[PDB]
Design a binder for this molecule. Structure first.
Ligand SMILES: O=P(O)(O)OC[C@H]1O[C@H](OP(=O)(O)OP(=O)(O)O)[C@H](O)[C@@H]1O
Ligand SMILES: O=P(O)(O)OC[C@H]1O[C@H](OP(=O)(O)OP(=O)(O)O)[C@H](O)[C@@H]1O
Ligand SMILES: Nc1nc2cc[nH]c2c(=O)[nH]1
Ligand SMILES: Nc1nc2cc[nH]c2c(=O)[nH]1
Ligand SMILES: [Mg+2]
Ligand SMILES: [Mg+2]
Ligand SMILES: [Mg+2]
Ligand SMILES: [Mg+2]
Lengths: 173, 173
């Protein structure tokens, strides 16, 4: 019962997330009802949201995954194993903060001739923006705080919390 | 409401999976209570189980991901971004069938000097084995047929079903 003792405040509960993914999943299913999109998870943080969102998205779709790191220079650690040419792409993310990561990826998929590119993110932190980037679908907006949980790490830990929270001061030493 | 029409039988319901991940998560949390393991998801299929299992695993842990493609020759498409040297590794998988994929990965992590290597899989199909390989933790045993859902694809589709099922014969046509 240790991680919970590191959390100062639960910002978004597991029950809130469960309701929101049920809602978004049905809306996204209708949006994509006449195509087989490629849903692309941005590793590592997107995995819990992507799993639970797409379980609630009752439509035919395919999945793939990318890994990126990050001065404004973004590096691909793992590229797709699927062509995006002529595909409808849905990028799945855990948080948009500065906007850098998704600005890079959207331009990459447009360069590769995607038919359309949309974004769904669990969390959006609009106060963090350094470039203009908005998602098509957003679970929750969050304040200008470092959050963890439901995919989001502090030094690679806490991703497995089933809720989104803020850390206690002492955790930062 | 269309994928369901492709399914002849639900083998394992969403409620069954939810109960089993709750049980396994608590067991695994105790096993790993005195270490920070590296949980490694085998893409693409492991993502739904890994998300839902680790949300129910109340312990400190880190995550990473690998992608492989199976003659018996296994190909790494995406390697880890984390060293396994001296780490306790938990491999997370959706199904073990022939055993090839995981026999490859276990040997790779031992070669890289992991302190320990264990496996948790959602499904196990013991009738499919071509090499000797057993997981430390198994959600469900399944019979000798092709299943889809909860991560498992037919031609990259059906991974987003929230249950495990068998496809109607017409789908193969
Ligand atoms: O909008 P940005 O300012 O670009 O920040 C958002 C990105 O940063 C985090 O990923 P991180 O690089 O920490 O990798 P991780 O997902 O593996 O934790 C987060 O999951 C997003 O991908
Ligand atoms: O025990 P085996 O006979 O080795 O079969 C098990 C593997 O095969 C499937 O993966 P697949 O190669 O289809 O890739 P996927 O996970 O991306 O679907 C499955 O998800 C396991 O990883
Ligand atoms: N865990 C975590 N990662 C990032 C990356 C950008 N913003 C955040 C945040 O608020 N929390
Ligand atoms: N979808 C799916 N993939 C694999 C890969 C090995 N066995 C199976 C199975 O039964 N179903
Ligand atoms: Mg990320
Ligand atoms: Mg991070
Ligand atoms: Mg697989
Ligand atoms: Mg497969």
């Amino acid at each position: 019962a240790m991680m919970n003792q590191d959390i100062e405040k639960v910002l978004i509960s597991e029950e809130q997330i469960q309701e929101k993914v049920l809602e978004l999943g049905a809306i996204i299913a209708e949006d994509y009802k006449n195509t087989v999109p490629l849903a692309i998870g941005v590793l590592k943080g997107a995995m819990p949201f992507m799993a639970d969102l797409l379980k609630r998205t009752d439509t035919y779709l395919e999945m793939d995954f990318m890994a990126v790191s990050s001065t404004g220079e973004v590096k691909i650690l793992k590229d797709l194993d699927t062509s995006v040419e002529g595909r409808d792409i849905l990028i799945v993310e855990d948080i948009i903060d500065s906007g850098l990561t998704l600005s890079y990826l959207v331009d990459l998929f447009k360069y590769r001739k995607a038919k359309s590119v949309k974004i769904v993110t669990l969390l959006d932190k609009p106060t963090g923006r350094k470039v203009d980037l908005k998602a098509d679908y957003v679970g929750f907006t969050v304040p200008h705080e470092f959050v963890v949980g439901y995919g989001l790490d502090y030094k690679e830990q806490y991703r497995n919390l089933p809720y989104v929270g803020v850390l206690k001061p002492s955790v930062y030493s």
